[PDB]
Amino acid sequence: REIVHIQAGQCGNQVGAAFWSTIADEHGLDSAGIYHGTSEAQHERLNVYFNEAAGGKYVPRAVLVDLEPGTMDAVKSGKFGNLFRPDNIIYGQSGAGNIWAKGHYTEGAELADAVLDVVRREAEACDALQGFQLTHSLGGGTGSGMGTLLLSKIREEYPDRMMATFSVAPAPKSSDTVVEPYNATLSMHQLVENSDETFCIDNEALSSIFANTLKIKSPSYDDLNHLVSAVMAGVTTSFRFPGELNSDLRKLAVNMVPFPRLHFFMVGFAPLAAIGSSSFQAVSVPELTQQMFDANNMMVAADPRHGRYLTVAALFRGKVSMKEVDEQIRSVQTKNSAYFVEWIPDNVLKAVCSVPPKDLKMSATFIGNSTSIQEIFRRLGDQFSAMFRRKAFLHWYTGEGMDEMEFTEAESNMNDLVSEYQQYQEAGI
Amino acid sequence: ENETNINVVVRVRGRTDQEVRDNSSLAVSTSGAMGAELAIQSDPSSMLVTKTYAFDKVFGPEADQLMLFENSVAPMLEQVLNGYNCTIFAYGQTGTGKTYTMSGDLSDSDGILSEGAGLIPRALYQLFSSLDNSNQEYAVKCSYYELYNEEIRDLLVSEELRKPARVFEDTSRRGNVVITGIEESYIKNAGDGLRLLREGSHRRQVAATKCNDLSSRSHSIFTITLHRKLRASKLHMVDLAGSENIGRSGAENKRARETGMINQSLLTLGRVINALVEKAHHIPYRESKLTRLLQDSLGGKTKTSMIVTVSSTNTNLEETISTLEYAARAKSIRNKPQNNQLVF
Amino acid sequence: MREVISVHVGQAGVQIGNACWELYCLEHGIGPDGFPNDGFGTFFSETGQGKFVPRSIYVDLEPNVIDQVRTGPYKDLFHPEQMVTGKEDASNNYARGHYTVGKEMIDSVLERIRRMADNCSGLQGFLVFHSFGGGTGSGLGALLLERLNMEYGKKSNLQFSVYPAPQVSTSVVEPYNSVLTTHATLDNSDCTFMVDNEACYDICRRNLDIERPTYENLNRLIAQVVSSITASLRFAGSLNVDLNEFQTNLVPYPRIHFPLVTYSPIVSAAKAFHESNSVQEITNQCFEPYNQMVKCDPRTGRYMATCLLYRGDVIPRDVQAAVTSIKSRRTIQFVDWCPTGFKIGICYEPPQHVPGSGIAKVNRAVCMLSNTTSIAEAWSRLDHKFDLMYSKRAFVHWYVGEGMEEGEFSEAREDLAALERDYEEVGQD
Ligand SMILES: C/C(=C\c1csc(C)n1)[C@@H]1C[C@@H]2O[C@]2(C)CCC[C@H](C)[C@H](O)[C@@H](C)C(=O)C(C)(C)[C@@H](O)CC(=O)O1
Ligand SMILES: Nc1nc2c(ncn2[C@@H]2O[C@H](COP(=O)(O)OP(=O)(O)OP(=O)(O)O)[C@@H](O)[C@H]2O)c(=O)[nH]1
Ligand SMILES: Nc1ncnc2c1ncn2[C@@H]1O[C@H](COP(=O)(O)OP(=O)(O)NP(=O)(O)O)[C@@H](O)[C@H]1O
Ligand SMILES: Nc1nc2c(ncn2[C@@H]2O[C@H](COP(=O)(O)OP(=O)(O)O)[C@@H](O)[C@H]2O)c(=O)[nH]1
Ligand SMILES: [Mg+2]
């Protein structure tokens, strides 16, 4: 059971050094790549991400593709440079320009032939693929313009396996570049169709965690990307160890997705507290779940209280039994009858992994599916609306060769993705 | 008028000698005089008699081409000459006759005409026939391609060319869902209709089931552009593939694509009319490429006909009656026929 | 020898099956090798040396829980060619379960049965227990009976498949994978013993006073009623209740074959100490609904036919003097057309307790089985759910997208409601 990992883009690069650092520490690998086992769980399921080599040397399934040749040297010539086969590392010369219409016009047309060729032997050298991760961004060009074209090949290539993309979202307020309403919705056009699902993450929401819970007002991006690697590990936590139930990446997506259009999700994590709030916190299974339904613990700034939960999958790392979970959720589904969908009854999935984390007693990885996500999209389209009617910031896309009316196709795709959620945010049928 | 005009007809196939003489199949369909509600029963003088389904034109294993064609297609052939878009498509279980319904025979006796050739070669000539004697200028174009696993292959050309990016909308109308990146061809007469459709219908992917060696898997779609004179009414002749069961295919992973993804869009064809029994706050037309194209067809500005070809042999009771609820539920939806003289 | 065999499909087949064979070996006093009442090893195949092979086969599509058995304290017990693993899980998809990946794996399983079937002296019938909620045991077990009852014909078929209920749930396609299974169980199985995960849990909270029970504490309750039926014959007792006899004393009609399970006494450590154990007060426990295995209301409905399997030191006249204290005295009337309602046998030897559960040693034990009319509120819980899960056709594209036509969804609710039309008709005075 292997999956294929892609870090397409600059944000793909700096999440991956945050990703694989907490994965290699989780199975007991060092910072170099040699093995140091704790018990048999770390001996048998290193067959999830890692291909073998001579001795106890392990190589992760990864391709890390960028167009900007600078920041790849921060992980190649930088630390963990002995933990990637440099044939897998592949990157051109010219920068994108924070342009969707350039990473999908010309640069993918000059790398994604040779990028996909490296993906060939990584896929063939396992027995059974499971998923195909392409954790990227939507803001800049490389993570988006290649992030769609490298996506759209694989559905034409491997029409069976699954897609788990962790594309980060632009912010309604704290946005970072100026091409964000164009560089999102073009990528949102390709990502609704070909991707199986995605997990949105917004930085403006992520800043609210450190400003309310951990009480740090001066973090770093390297500190911030360190936090998302919880739920990166949190998804395949149920599989990489001896579990008790419902252990698969597929067992999530077969019943987290009611219709094959919506596919989008909200992410929460628990517990987390500063060193001042450390010991005074207790670690209880009812005490965790009350954190997981707060709007101060989500990774997208849309209010979940404002919407309704279609589906909820709870994935727990540690020592936790069955009705410990549910009996607190019983009181939750009484206090929140305006928050649960009625026409889909019994909307709670649960998943228990029987291995604790490091330096923790229990943990709770949360997957949510609100109807609040259309509001960010309506926020995104409203940002799109004033940007397009003037047709400013335009000829750096058509000048590369994308059609003018092709945007209106994407907005019509974008608007329709918004337009399915208003059935269900007010749903008595 | 502006009524609830949605045309639905049912014509079952005929049993063979080995089937019912072994199986003693259902007694659910009549000899097919006119459309009337029959029954749902098996072991009829016993405790399985449930209900009937109200019909428009039920026909048993008795109906022929010109019995159907003069009453179903021909009152809408005049609507095409009247300047209106029309839509005709068939549906049913696999191996029942819905490929026979659109394109039936390849006899093609080119002295005069063919016999039993299906609705499209009857609607081919009988639009070229009446157009020859109505004292106006005419120009005829067509485009014939297929739909297969969320992909489009041009059945007009055998070359390996496809769409550049995506299916396009327009800012002119809402009912347009235009498909560029694909060729339409010019047609002079009735003698050029079958001339391109012959090799054109051969370009599709006729797979082989355990049941039939002819029950294909693609979605044949036959579009017509009529530039008579200044005006143009597009006409949709659409084939649909079958609702394939699990065990009656022998399908491996190469066959499961044209099993699963085909049934994926046929299920999608369910909810796009299951949401029109009450027409709530969203109409999910954009779920697959089969229903984006039929957006102006299904409940839109276009007159729409529908064929439900089922099997009367007891190969099932699962979707023996389940497929007839599609015409039964979504009968009562309305449209709006609009005129087309394109002002230059 | 009155021989029996086992199969196990899904993790419910594994985890209940892990607890079944543990409790068996302590009854027959064997460890991994054996022998640290004379023989009677109908569960076991005898080798020429002493390593008794349990007549069983585990079937799972995902090699996760099978590694636990092949590495834990029971890898030195089984026949490692018999423990067949799959490649990729059904993953809560009955179409993947019953048809697609199961077809590519049944033909390394069905022939594996036949070698174990042709080694039988004379085989009576056997047991196929799994879950309805999950993927593989719902789907592959559905094909596993119809590809067996086609072959072996007049031989008996039982199943102890575990059943979902609205309080505690794990997956959210549990309405779909139950009612898509019950077509297979209607015409293939002679009988089934459905059991809840909730009433199984609640007795571990109330009548065991264990605060947070785990699944092995759930399963050791479950496997004990399994021991109290088959191997109850395999101790020499004063009476005999044969596997044929359940197929006479509990089934008036070929469709009414859904008994319930009730076990007694289930008393924790500090409470049997300070308690006696009569014959009569323990049979009084049996007709209390607090020892019930499926969340139903038996005092509302009537009983078509009952069965009481006593274990331990039992005199057979407190059978008769106390059964009329239940039958002739109490409020809960029987069916007017069933004239007696009771069948009862006495097995002399005591039940065996595990040394690591809250349950304690007791000199007598009753495994109540009864075909009631109050189980009609079990199917109404699912068919009301299966209604609203279907009325918008949500979560259907993961089934029809695999190959199942929707025509079974018509016949599921048509047959299941008509199956409830016999409980309202036979139970109608
Ligand atoms: C103390 C503690 C949890 C806890 C609950 S009860 C108990 C006893 N311990 C957390 C770890 C908790 O696992 C997360 C989710 C660890 C989450 C990972 C992030 C990076 C840290 O939580 C974040 C605050 C940090 O960057 C620093 C401050 C460096 C970390 O040390 C903080 C930090 O990680 O400490
Ligand atoms: N009785 C019992 N039921 C359990 C136990 N653990 C889980 N279950 C039930 O088993 C269901 C899951 O069934 P599975 O065996 O995993 O189904 P599957 O087809 O094997 O699915 P996967 O193997 O996980 O792909 C859960 O929904 C629970 O209802 C247990 O210890 N005892
Ligand atoms: N009503 C009918 N009358 C006479 N022949 C029929 C009829 N229906 C089907 N056939 C015969 O059935 C064969 C064609 O198979 P067909 O039944 O059309 O498949 P299908 O139902 O259309 N499936 P598919 O092609 O996958 O969409 C030909 O031999 C036809 O003559
Ligand atoms: N360093 C860092 N930046 C992030 C992260 N998530 C999102 N971003 C920002 O999101 C935007 C996306 O830009 P990006 O695709 O990386 O730039 P590109 O090189 O043009 O593709 C930039 O402003 C990034 O800084 C993260 O985890 N770390
Ligand atoms: Mg057909």
Author numbering:
A (entry chain B): 2 to 430
B (entry chain K): 101 to 329, 351 to 465
C (entry chain A): 1 to 36, 50 to 442
Verbatim from the authors:
Kinesin-5 motors are conserved among eukaryotes and undertake related roles in cell division, driving spindle pole separation and stabilization of spindle bipolarity. Cut7, the sole kinesin-5 in fission yeast, was among the first mitotic kinesins to be identified and is essential for spindle pole body separation. While most kinesin-5 motors take steps toward MT plus ends, several yeast kinesin-5s including Cut7 have been shown to be bidirectional, being able to move to MT plus or minus ends according to molecular context. αβ-Tubulin heterodimers are the building blocks of MTs and are among the most highly conserved proteins in eukaryotes.
